[PDB]
Design a protein around this nucleic acid. Structure first.
Ligand SMILES: [Ca+2]
Ligand SMILES: [Mg+2]
Ligand SMILES: [Mg+2]
Length: 430
DNA sequence: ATTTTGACGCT
């Protein structure tokens, strides 16, 4: 009752660039705009692996992870842009730099947590308070929310998508109590106004469109963001949670898409997030551990406390390459040459990072996979990263991994290596 | 033969 927390203390948004690598390539090459197109890495093996797909091409069934040759079977007019290749490997610099463009714009509005190359959480609580004080009891016009969906509306006593969107927004705004500045629904609504402004600024200043979710925590904001894509934003209120979760597969909630969510489904014999409400906190802790159990107990009620962390920059800078099938590295010279390629890309990115961001990495992590091992990484070792020098870093990585070679032959490497991975970590201010 | 990333939890 009067003491039960409701998780309505913050306004949190999640902003997600639509088909991001595709938009970067479409901005650069106008011939690709408004066409079925995809971004592909490499080209020799089956036309290359697709890593991003425009919504026009998704309509044909083209997906990420698909080989371009197969996608062309679904979509014969599919246009393709290739990721740059440098030093023998795919090089993602263009997309990292485009990401910085967008994150710097978002940071003008509020504190952001970089969640991936194309998405960030936004803590809007303070910005909403200030905007509410500026408004001075003035109602919020639908014109301030031209791309916003209110999840769960319209309801109760038009057959077009935009007409439905507007009907629901009208019902929401008609019900709103705009004179209580502490009202969580009003706070979410002002948050959505700010996110419309943020998304307009991103599009004006970069050309890139994005979607967004606005709710009271990160998990609900992330879920909301996916409800109406592309180029739209969705407000998920606390009150919408019971209906939304009542048919929501557990795997759709962030962190439950893998083994833990599978165990929740199997052990409890349920399918939907809302079904979790029927268990006590102790029951859930008994099955899934103290932390996970408490988290699930709160989350199925719409409540999550994970903070938006103030972190706009990645914590690690890494470079990796797979060597599948017959290309697995089987000689020492091969291993050393590719460690050098990876180390040279790493040195370039690290020097740029030091100049831009006033920090230096202090640890070098070396990871390899051996042929036959099902795990993505077979071995991980660390060593000191004391100089931004590619020859030193590659020599050090070889030193820490050279004892993995079973081969009694000096020149040969066995078992063959199917993956090399160098990662700079443990940054310190510089 | 997806590939190339990135963050965080466990012990
Ligand atoms: Ca995206
Ligand atoms: Mg995606
Ligand atoms: Mg994303």
């Amino acid at each position: 009752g009067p003491h039960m927390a409701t998780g309505q203390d913050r306004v949190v948004a999640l902003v997600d660039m639509d088909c991001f690598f595709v938009q970067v390539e479409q901005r650069q090459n106008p011939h690709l705009r408004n066409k079925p197109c995809a971004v592909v890495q490499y080209k020799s093996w089956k036309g290359g692996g697709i890593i991003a797909v425009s919504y026009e091409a998704r309509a044909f069934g083209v997906t990420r992870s698909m080989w371009a040759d197969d996608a062309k079977k679904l979509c014969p007019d599919l246009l393709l842009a290739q990721v740059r290749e440098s030093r023998g490997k795919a090089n993602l610099t263009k997309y990292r730099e485009a990401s910085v463009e967008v994150m710097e714009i978002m940071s003008r509005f509020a504190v952001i947590e970089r969640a991936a190359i194309d998405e960030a959480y936004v803590d809007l609580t303070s910005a909403v308070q200030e905007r509410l004080q500026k408004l001075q009891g003035q109602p919020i016009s639908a014109d301030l929310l031209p791309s916003t969906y209110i999840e769960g509306l319209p309801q109760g006593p038009t057959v077009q998508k935009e007409g439905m969107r507007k009907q629901g927004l009208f019902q929401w705004l008609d019900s709103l109590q705009i004179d209580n500045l502490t009202s969580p629904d009003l706070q979410l609504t002002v948050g959505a106004v700010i996110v419309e402004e943020m998304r307009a600024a991103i599009e004006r200043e970069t050309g890139f469109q994005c979607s967004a979710g606005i709710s009271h925590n990160k998990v609900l904001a992330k879920l909301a963001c996916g409800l109406n894509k592309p180029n739209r934003q969705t407000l998920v209120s606390h009150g919408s949670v019971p209906q939304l979760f009542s048919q929501m597969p557990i795997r759709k909630i962030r962190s439950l898409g893998g083994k833990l969510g599978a165990s929740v489904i199997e052990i409890l014999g349920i399918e939907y997030m809302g079904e979790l409400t029927q268990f006590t906190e102790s029951q859930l802790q008994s099955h899934f551990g103290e932390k996970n159990g408490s988290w699930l107990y709160a989350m199925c009620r719409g409540i999550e406390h994970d903070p938006v962390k103030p972190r706009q920059l990645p914590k690690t800078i890494g470079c990796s390459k797979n060597f599948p099938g017959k290309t697995a590295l089987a000689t020492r010279e091969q291993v050393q040459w590719w460690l050098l390629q990876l180390a040279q890309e790493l040195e370039e990115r690290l020097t740029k990072d030091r100049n831009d961001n006033d920090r230096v990495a202090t640890q070098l992590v070396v990871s390899i996979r051996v042929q036959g091992d099902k795990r993505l990484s077979s071995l991980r070792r660390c060593c000191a990263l004391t100089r931004y020098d590619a020859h030193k870093m590659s020599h050090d990585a070889f030193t820490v991994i050279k004892n993995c070679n079973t081969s009694g032959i000096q020149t040969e490497w066995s078992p063959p290596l199917t993956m090399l991975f160098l990662c700079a970590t443990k940054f310190s201010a510089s």
